[PDB]
Write a protein that binds this ligand. Structure first.
Ligand code: CHL
Ligand code: CHL
Ligand code: CLA
Ligand code: CLA
Ligand code: CLA
Ligand code: CLA
Ligand code: CLA
Ligand SMILES: CC(/C=C/C=C(C)/C=C/[C@@]12O[C@]1(C)C[C@@H](O)CC2(C)C)=C\C=C\C=C(C)\C=C\C=C(C)\C=C\[C@@]12O[C@]1(C)C[C@@H](O)CC2(C)C
Ligand SMILES: CC(/C=C/C=C(C)/C=C/[C@@]12O[C@]1(C)C[C@@H](O)CC2(C)C)=C\C=C\C=C(C)\C=C\C=C(C)\C=C\[C@@]12O[C@]1(C)C[C@@H](O)CC2(C)C
Ligand SMILES: CC1=C[C@H](O)CC(C)(C)[C@H]1/C=C/C(C)=C/C=C/C(C)=C/C=C/C=C(C)/C=C/C=C(C)/C=C/C1=C(C)C[C@H](O)CC1(C)C
Ligand SMILES: CC1=C(/C=C/C(C)=C/C=C/C(C)=C\C=C\C=C(C)\C=C\C=C(C)\C=C\C2=C(C)CCCC2(C)C)C(C)(C)CCC1
Lengths: 203, 42, 205, 156
């Protein structure tokens, strides 16, 4: 209730009550006004939090380490065009299959919780998670780290979304910067460090 | 949220969405296989 | 119950007595008994023709390429000729006996057992029924009478189903494979095994 | 019926010659590299490959240099009418068979009026693929005698 709100002193929507991790009462348009869409959208925000987190790691870390002389990674922007040990198309096809397997099973768990967590081949490999979107198990919790008391996971999960939100902005940061500036993200950092009051969007 | 989906499901709104998709599909096919006076596959 | 789609529940009518009941009929194609009862045989007759059919396509091209024997491609077999075989008459001939055997099977499902009480002698006993519509084993159709009709029928038919279901798919492969590659099926395998990441349907197009 | 093949008809190869010359007439007025000169050139190639495909797939041309269709069923020409025709009839039933399933599906409700002006999208999604196998499904209905009714027509 008295949890911090995005807009202090405003009245948060009723369907947001602070239970979920990262609920700062932010939903002006009420996309999660009804419970069901909220449930789906919770997943939507969750996975988007993880992909960008790798993408932020995928863009910034190599470009940083190649800006200094340690490695050779090219720009993420033209990363797709590069020619690797085979054609791009088949790798994308191979990516279509394998991801579709996890994006298939994950789909089953979403529409029907708890009906997917046992290994189809070696049935003693059952997964341990109970919350939808938190698979648990030895593959995805090699030491646990998710099986704890509340007010800790709520802290931890909020430490998972609040970072993910930080990623999704950053990668779209690297997105638009590469388009209307001619260089990588780190250059856009440095040219902003030499003359902070001059070198900005306003060139 | 429910009321928005219901409105989007009323007949006229589906029609433009459905036909619009249909128009896009036919235009694409004619862009890739133009003139198309016969069906010369078999 | 280990359906085809782990999360999805199987439909209510595919209870499971039919061998190979992997709860799979999405389009609502079997929600009437008389429908479903007549559909099972189709899968049984199709699969059996599709089990031998692939082997005839497969084995013949395998022996020819290696060099043990020589035969035309199954694609090229339709125009083959040796002697005294007008493709006209053969069609009529094959239509005759197949017409004979197909119908008497059809009369069996239409009327069980109304096929082995007649005048013509010496054979009026075996062609009664196998006691299971799609399995007409008799002491002529199972000359090595080696069935108990109940127990293995759950555990052995399930082999013949999953055998056939695979075989029907495989034949569909060659038809499309020959339709695009213009070549033999093993040739398709031999070509792809050469450079798999460059010999693929993406390159075939 | 005397329709010579288009790959042979000199009249066909005349129409191809004029329409190319007519376009090349409209081209020698712009810059040799401006946007109009490219769009004109694009249509020029599209034309030549149009005529070639008509002189390749066995279309028969009359004395007008124009293709003529043989819809008589001579299976030397199956892709002109018969093959596209069967392609339509497959589609047309799919539209027909799906729509029938829906009306029957929503028929048993409190007021079928509301579920047709406000279409149920989910129910129409689990029915949209059942039109993939309409020839099989319908032909069984006809045999089983549920494709039609007999003398109970209005009301119920
Ligand atoms: C997620 C994802 C995102 C955000 C991108 C983004 C991009 N890809 Mg990429 N891709 C992504 C997934 C994948 N891509 C590719 C394979 C390619 C290729 C071959 C190319 C791109 C290109 C591009 C760029 C297109 C420029 C643009 O969008 O103009 C607004 C852009 C940087 C193009 C590029 O690099 O142009 C500079 C390009 O040629 N991608 C594969 C298959 C392995 C992917 C699998 O998920
Ligand atoms: C029932 C399965 C069956 C299938 C899938 C085929 C399909 C084929 N037959 Mg065929 N036949 C079949 C049964 C029979 N055929 C024939 C009599 C012939 C003849 C005379 C010819 C074919 C030919 C062909 C080929 C047509 C060329 C083509 O389709 O280009 C894609 C193709 C392999 C032609 C061929 O072999 O060309 C290479 C050919 O000349 N068939 C008889 C006896 C009437 C059959 C009995 O069921
Ligand atoms: C597609 C991603 C996505 C999805 C599905 C959701 C979904 C949801 N969010 Mg959310 N959120 C996101 C991204 C997303 N969010 C981002 C990027 C941020 C950081 C700005 C936040 C910050 C945020 C807060 C603070 C809160 C939510 C909440 C909720 C709720 C299109 C745009 C207009 C343009 C973007 C393009 C630019 C960036 C370039 C609902 C489940 C509320 C909740 O209850 O949390 C659980 C809540 O209080 N979100
Ligand atoms: C983590 C987010 C993040 C960060 C650190 C930066 C940082 C920077 N951006 Mg950038 N950007 C971002 C997101 C971000 N951006 C997003 C989401 C977009 C898409 C709209 C852009 C689009 C963009 C363009 C088109 C340009 C920059 C440029 C720059 C540099 C100079 C600042 C400027 O003029 O842009 C001002 C930035 C904006 C108008 C968009 C910022 C949008 C974010 C979401 C606002 C909130 C930032 C966030 C709260 C900061 C977190 C605090 C702390 C962690 C630092 C600077 C290094 C410029 C450059 O190259 O300088 C030479 C430039 O031309 N950015
Ligand atoms: C119901 C009668 C009818 C029939 C059978 C056809 C049949 C055809 N039309 Mg056509 N057309 C029709 C009415 C009809 N049209 C009407 C009423 C108009 C005016 C809106 C057009 C305007 C039109 C154009 C502009 C084009 C076709 C094209 C075509 C061809 C389609 C090629 C393809 O998709 O593959 C095919 C011969 C395409 C073609 O190349 O024709 C040969 C093409 O570009 N049609
Ligand atoms: C493979 C396997 C595992 C079996 C297994 C079996 N078949 Mg079968 N069958 C096969 C191939 C196979 N068959 C092929 C390729 C054909 C066509 C030549 C047949 C024709 C066939 C007939 C005609 C009969 C069987 C019968 C049986 C029995 C057992 C279930 C018999 C049976 O069940 O008798 C009770 C029986 O009637 N099958
Ligand atoms: C499911 C849709 C459907 C079906 C199966 C039929 C079936 C039939 N109609 Mg028909 N009809 C329909 C809709 C339909 N109608 C609608 C919406 C109209 C108003 C324009 C008509 C107007 C109409 C006339 C005027 C005539 C028929 C006739 C006939 C019969 C002969 C077929 C024919 O001539 O087609 C006629 C085809 C049309 C007129 C084309 C319009 C049909 C549209 C394009 C289909 C609509 C499908 C629906 C919107 C999709 C629902 C999807 C769902 C998932 C939401 C046949 C019983 C004829 C008859 O009596 O013959 C015995 C006849 O004279 N109908
Ligand atoms: C920002 C974003 C979504 C933002 C959503 C917003 C703001 C919505 C806000 C609202 O809805 C709420 C909250 C409440 C409503 O009442 C109000 C509004 C305001 C309407 C998603 C980004 C999501 C960003 C993602 C998922 C980034 C993924 C990165 C990936 C996949 C990896 C890519 C790479 O592989 C390539 C492409 C090339 C390699 O070289 C490099 C790497 C980086 C490795
Ligand atoms: C019979 C068959 C093939 C038999 C082959 C034969 C005789 C080959 C003969 C020859 O080679 C030889 C021997 C020698 C050559 O010299 C001569 C020829 C003639 C060349 C294949 C069947 C092939 C049949 C196939 C592949 C059928 C596939 C059906 C599918 C996938 C349907 C799925 C669904 O219906 C369900 C299951 C449930 C629904 O709810 C959902 C949907 C999807 C609608
Ligand atoms: C924009 C821009 C622009 C300019 O140009 C420049 C700049 C400024 C630089 C930029 C910025 C950026 C940013 C902000 C970024 C951020 C990022 C992030 C956050 C990431 C994360 C990210 C995140 C991440 C990775 C995460 C990760 C995680 C992990 C791995 C985990 C793991 C695990 C698990 C499962 C569990 C188990 O039991 C154990 C473990 C093993 C532990
Ligand atoms: C071969 C040919 C030809 C001819 C043709 C003809 C002559 C035909 C006839 C036809 C006819 C004479 C027909 C009749 C019919 C009748 C009826 C009676 C029908 C019915 C149908 C129905 C009933 C259907 C229904 C349905 C379905 C199934 C699908 C859709 C939906 C519905 C429900 C509608 C020509 C020369 C052109 C050309 C060449 C080819």
């Amino acid at each position: 209730p008295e949890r911090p709100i995005w807009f202090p002193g405003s009245t948060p929507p009723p369907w947001l009550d602070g239970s979920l991790p990262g609920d700062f009462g932010f939903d002006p348009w009420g996309l999660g006004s009804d419970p069901e869409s909220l449930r789906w959208n919770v997943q939507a925000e969750l996975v988007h939090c993880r992909w960008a987190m790798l993408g932020a790691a995928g863009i910034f870390i190599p470009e940083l380490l190649t800006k200094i002389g340690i490695l050779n990674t090219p720009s993420w922007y033209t990363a797709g065009e590069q020619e690797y040990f085979t054609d791009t198309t088949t790798l994308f096809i191979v990516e279509l299959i394998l991801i579709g397997w996890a994006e298939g099973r994950r789909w089953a768990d979403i529409i029907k919780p708890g009906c997917v967590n046992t290994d189809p081949i070696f049935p003693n490999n059952k997964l341990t998670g109970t919350d939808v979107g938190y698979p648990g198990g030895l593959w995805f919790d090699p030491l646990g780290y998710g099986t704890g008391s509340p007010e800790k996971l709520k802290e931890l999960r909020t430490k998972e979304i609040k970072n993910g939100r930080l990623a999704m902005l950053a990668v779209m940061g690297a997105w638009f910067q590469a388009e209307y500036t001619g260089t990588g993200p780190i250059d856009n950092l440095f040219a902003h460090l030499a003359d902070p009051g001059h070198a900005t969007i306003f060139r | 949220m429910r009321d928005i989906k219901t409105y989007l499901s009323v007949a006229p709104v589906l029609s433009t969405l459905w036909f619009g998709a249909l128009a896009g599909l036919l235009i694409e096919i004619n862009r890739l296989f133009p003139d198309a006076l016969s069906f010369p596959f078999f | 119950r280990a359906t085809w789609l782990p999360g999805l529940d199987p439909p209510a009518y595919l209870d499971g007595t039919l061998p190979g009941d992997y709860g799979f009929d999405p389009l609502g194609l079997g929600e009437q008994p008389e429908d479903l009862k007549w559909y099972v045989q189709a899968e049984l007759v199709h699969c059996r023709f599709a089990m031998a059919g692939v082997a005839g396509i497969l084995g013949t091209d395998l022996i020819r390429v290696s060099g043990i024997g020589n035969l035309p491609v199954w694609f090229e077999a339709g125009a083959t000729k040796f002697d005294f075989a007008n493709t006209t008459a053969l069609f009529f001939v094959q239509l005759l006996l197949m017409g004979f055997v197909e119908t008497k099977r059809y009369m069996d499902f239409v009327s069980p057992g109304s096929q082995a009480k007649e005048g013509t002698f010496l054979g009026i006993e075996a062609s009664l029924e196998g006691l299971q519509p799609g399995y007409p084993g008799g002491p002529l159709f199972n000359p090595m009478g080696l069935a108990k009709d109940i127990e293995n029928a759950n555990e052995v038919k399930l082999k013949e189903i999953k055998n056939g279901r695979l075989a029907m798919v495989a034949m569909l492969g060659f038809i499309v494979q020959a339709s695009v590659t213009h070549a033999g099926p093993i040739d398709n395998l031999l070509t792809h095994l050469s450079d798999p990441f460059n010999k693929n349907i993406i390159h075939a197009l | 019926a005397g329709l010579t093949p288009c790959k042979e008809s000199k009249a066909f190869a005349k129409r191809e010659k004029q329409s190319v010359k007519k376009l090349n007439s409209s081209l020698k007025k712009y810059a040799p590299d401006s946007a109009p000169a490219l769009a004109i050139q694009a249509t020029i190639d599209k034309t030549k490959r149009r005529f070639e495909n008509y002189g390749k797939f066995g279309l028969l041309c009359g004395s007008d240099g124009l293709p003529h269709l043989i819809v008589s069923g001579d299976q030397r020409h199956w892709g002109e009418f018969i093959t596209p025709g069967v392609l339509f009839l497959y589609i047309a039933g799919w539209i027909g068979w799906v729509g029938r399933s829906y009306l029957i599906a929503v028929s048993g409700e409190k007021k079928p009026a509301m579920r047709e002006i406000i279409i149920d999208v989910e129910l129409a999604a689990r029915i949209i693929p059942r039109g993939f196998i309409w020839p099989v499904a319908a032909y069984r209905e006809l045999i089983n005698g549920d494709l039609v009714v007999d003398d109970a027509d209005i009301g119920y």
